């Protein structure tokens, strides 16, 4: 079932979400399944549970081909609960971000180029991966949602913030 | 003639506009007349020339009744060239701003509560006024456009930034 994606301005995206405590549950599986479906219909690369108004530390992401990027490399389809993130270097990198809670817009955002993230698959088994570049950016972006942060508050260069159909920054 | 209002992301809003040097001209009068017409059709409270892609230090503003505010007090219909602004106190005040170059959105922005602004009416006669509150905010906002600045880059509290139909901040 496709959920409504709530848009920026909705208090519910400002919350710090509590942990997922029903790993392996049929309820949790139904929720993630809805998440992938919603992300897919909206052509997202990632989706955080608070974006469909569920106050949980849960995100889905990944894709083979993005209509949106387009030529970002493939990121594996992942559902990850109780995400915690550590950078593996100080190196930052600028890239375009957008949000389905913010349709039409985009901006350039510095993120860590190299991270390890840790958490749980919905069946309860542990996930830990090192990631870089676009992969790492997506997971940093979705994580911010879990902690009530959106991308505008990370913009350093405001010249790069605008509507997707109007921007012409490199 | 109603002009297209260009939207955020358009490089042309990032420019520092040169002075108006054709005061009293029929050309300048036609341009301001278009500006008021455009502002009116879009229900704006102010409009800066760069927002219709004319690279000049010129702004129009004012209204009796705003659909948008609504209950802001009346600000007189003013066309002002070569605006220069000075604050008359250090007192800052938070209020909602929006932009027709940014439709759907709004945020709370600190501005000086008290300013003097100076410049020229289109016939060339000098204008200098002291203004406060909403009046002052409008003129500070339009001025930023002349210097290639938009409101996101003035946001301090990102919780207050969102879509007009979704926000519920006080």
């Amino acid at each position: 079932m496709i959920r409504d994606i709530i848009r920026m301005g909705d208090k519910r995206l400002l919350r710090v979400a509590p942990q997922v405590t029903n790993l392996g549950s049929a309820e949790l599986h139904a929720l993630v399944s809805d998440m992938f479906e919603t992300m897919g219909a909206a052509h997202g690369v990632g989706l955080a549970a608070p974006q469909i108004a569920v106050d949980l530390q849960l995100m889905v992401f990944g894709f083979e081909a993005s209509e949106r990027y387009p030529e970002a490399p493939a990121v594996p389809l992942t559902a990850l609960a109780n995400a915690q993130i550590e950078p593996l270097s100080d190196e930052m990198e600028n890239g375009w971000e957008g949000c389905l809670s913010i349709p039409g817009l985009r901006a350039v955002i510095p993120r860590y180029r190299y991270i390890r993230y840790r958490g749980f698959a919905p069946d309860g088994s542990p996930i830990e991966r090192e990631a870089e570049g676009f992969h790492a950016r997506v997971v940093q972006h979705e994580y911010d949602h879990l902690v009530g942060r959106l991308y505008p508050s990370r913009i350093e260069n405001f010249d790069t913030f605008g509507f997707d159909d109007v921007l012409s920054y490199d």
Side-chain angles (χ1 to χ4, degrees), chain A residues 98-143:
Chain A
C99 193
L100 324 151
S101 289
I102 273 168
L105 302 128
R106 50 180 232 255
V108 167
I109 306 297
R111 297 296 188 175
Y112 292 109
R113 168 145 257 281
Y114 303 98
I115 73 181
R116 185 155 46 232
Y117 63 89
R118 279 204 227 267
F120 300 90
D123 64 5
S125 48
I127 282 165
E128 66 77 41
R129 288 173 194 168
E130 18 296 323
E132 66 147 299
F134 189 73
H135 196 158
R137 158 177 318 275
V138 161
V139 163
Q140 297 172 71
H141 175 103
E142 296 319 329
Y143 179 79

Side-chain angles (χ1 to χ4, degrees), chain A residues 55-137:
Chain A
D55 196 12
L56 292 173
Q57 288 174 30
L58 179 65
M59 69 177 67
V60 296
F61 57 87
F63 60 94
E64 229 155 71
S66 194
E67 212 184 33
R68 225 160 259 261
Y69 282 91
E71 46 49 305
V75 168
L77 281 174
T78 311
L80 171 75
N82 311 337
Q84 39 164 82
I85 278 167
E86 199 172 325
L88 304 183
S89 130
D90 282 319
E91 192 172 17
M92 301 294 291
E93 181 170 55
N94 293 320
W96 290 104
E97 283 175 43
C99 193
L100 324 151
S101 289
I102 273 168
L105 302 128
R106 50 180 232 255
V108 167
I109 306 297
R111 297 296 188 175
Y112 292 109
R113 168 145 257 281
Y114 303 98
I115 73 181
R116 185 155 46 232
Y117 63 89
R118 279 204 227 267
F120 300 90
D123 64 5
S125 48
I127 282 165
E128 66 77 41
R129 288 173 194 168
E130 18 296 323
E132 66 147 299
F134 189 73
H135 196 158
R137 158 177 318 275

